[PDB]
């Protein structure tokens, strides 16, 4: 499908969240942030402490 | 936590079921029915369309 640019340092953790046919994704928890990654490639931005 | 919506109501067995996409619901109550008698539990896991 396609080559991600996240960044993982150690051993991650993640998990996927099913809403309907329009709303599925990852979420990582490197150890120091938070990222959100699409099942088709795309990377979207997280706001806030 | 599977998140789930409810689409169908059938009756069956002296009992009122209610059929989401991912789970199966059964309704009854202790009494006689009121807003502060009445319960939902959770019966199957079965999948449908």
């Keep these: 499908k396609r080559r991600l640019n996240i960044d993982v ?3 991650p953790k993640f998990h ?3 809403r309907d046919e329009h709303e599925q994704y990852y979420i990582v928890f490197n150890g120091s942030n ?3 990654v699409d099942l088709s ?3 979207y ?3 806030g402490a | 936590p599977r998140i789930s919506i409810l689409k169908y109501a059938v009756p069956f067995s002296e009992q009122l079921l ?3 996409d991912e789970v199966q619901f059964v ?3 202790s009494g006689v029915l009121t807003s502060k008698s009445i319960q ?3 019966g199957s896991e079965f999948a449908l369309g």
Excluded: A
């Design chain 1, 16 to 18: 996927l969240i099913n």
């Design chain 2, 18 to 20: 209610l059929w989401s």
């Design chain 2, 27 to 29: 309704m009854t109550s």
């Design chain 1, 34 to 36: 938070i990222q959100v």
């Design chain 1, 9 to 11: 340092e150690s051993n």
């Design chain 1, 41 to 43: 490639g795309n990377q």
């Design chain 2, 40 to 42: 939902l539990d959770v």
């Design chain 1, 45 to 47: 931005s997280v706001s």
